[PDB]
Amino acid sequence: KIPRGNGPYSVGCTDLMFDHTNKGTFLRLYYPSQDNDRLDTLWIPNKEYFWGLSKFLGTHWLMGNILRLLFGSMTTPANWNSPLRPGEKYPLVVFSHGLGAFRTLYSAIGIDLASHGFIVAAVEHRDRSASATYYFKDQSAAEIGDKSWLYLRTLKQEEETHIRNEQVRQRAKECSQALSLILDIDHGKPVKNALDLKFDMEQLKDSIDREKIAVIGHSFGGATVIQTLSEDQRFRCGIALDAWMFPLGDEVYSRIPQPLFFINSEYFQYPANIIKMKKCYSPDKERKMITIRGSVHQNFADFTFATGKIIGHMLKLKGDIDSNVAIDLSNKASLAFLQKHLGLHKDFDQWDCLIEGDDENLIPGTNINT
Ligand SMILES: CC1([C@@H]2CC(=O)N(CCOc3ccc(F)c(C#N)c3)C2)CCS(=O)(=O)CC1
Ligand SMILES: [Cl-]
Ligand code: NA
Incomplete structure (x- = not known):
């Protein structure tokens, strides 16, 4: 079991994708919640992440199906789509995952910060450093939920310096973009989450301690x-x-x-x-x-x-x-x-x-x- 937060606040979790494209922002949000009677959050929520982790490990793609079998129903102790705890402005952490990882794999950290009163935005990077990620080819595809998957890029020794630096610069840009999205949502701009989840982003309005x-x-x-x-x-x-x-x-x-x-x-x-x-x-x-x-x-x-x-x-x-x-x-x-x-x-x-x-x-x- 991934541990529960040590802080006083209960913890909620949801996903945000905006825009729907491969240049959009994709993040998992962890936040202080009121409600504590929601279903726990599914840790690795799509089969393609296991395929991703398998490629990352350099194993037969079928090892992915075995990882899914072992870990595919595991949850992390965050209330899925719980309402945000109102009445206080929360500082913000943007969190960046490792190579071969993705947005959901640092929930022990994210849940704990949230339980102490932080909002945590764990980005999913589209630099091909994630085991897998996904996005939508266009508007039509996003409506019907037709996901396009992007998998880890294996480098040759002679690409390493150049490509890792291209990726870290893209990662930084994705962090900055995530910040601007959240600050905009804070400043009340309507955003249509590309994922159809039962979490109204309008709750986030005036909920961020903007300079923290x-x-x-x-x-x-x-x-x-x-x-x-x-x-x-x-x-x-x-x-x-x-x-x-x-x-x-x-x-x-x-x-x-x-x-x-x-x-x-x-x-x-x-x-x-x-x-x-x-x-x-x-x-x-x-x-x-x-x-x-x-x-x-x-x-x-x-x-x-x-x-x-x-x-x-x-x-x-x-x-x-x-x-x-x-x-x-x-x-x-x-x-x-x-x-x-x-x-x-x-x-x-x-x-x-x-x-x-x-x-x-x-x-x-x-x-x-x-
Ligand atoms: C240093 C490093 C990578 C860089 C990086 O970011 N690393 C963390 C990956 O952490 C992960 C990866 C998948 C996961 F599922 C989870 C979970 N939970 C965590 C290790 C690149 C150079 S090397 O190849 O010589 C040795 C390895
Ligand atoms: Cl050394
Ligand atoms: Na900048």
């Missing part, structure tokens, strides 16, 4: 954080979860004025990647880094909760550290950082010492020597 915007992401999503910050000053801080720095151009490093927080796993990181992170540091800029002891790259994504302890450790979905323990540390430290740099008046400053890695399961900075 942050961007968060895992791995490829962590680079996306950094690109996004250096492209859109509307984002006031970033949190990179085990950032994979390779996609970034040499230009961006000196070009990130906003506070930035690296939350790393113990076993993923390596000198080349750490050196690139330290290239973001300048005396005039706010930068924090912590390393979660006994953790692996996958501790930040939902599949760390989807299998048993033994199978999970074997597949490097789980580390030596308990997955709930690990994600609690990442989430609580994130909340403290956000409160600090968005100027929130909540109680997240109780976790301030975790930003400093002052905990028996944290390492201040990094374990990697460079």
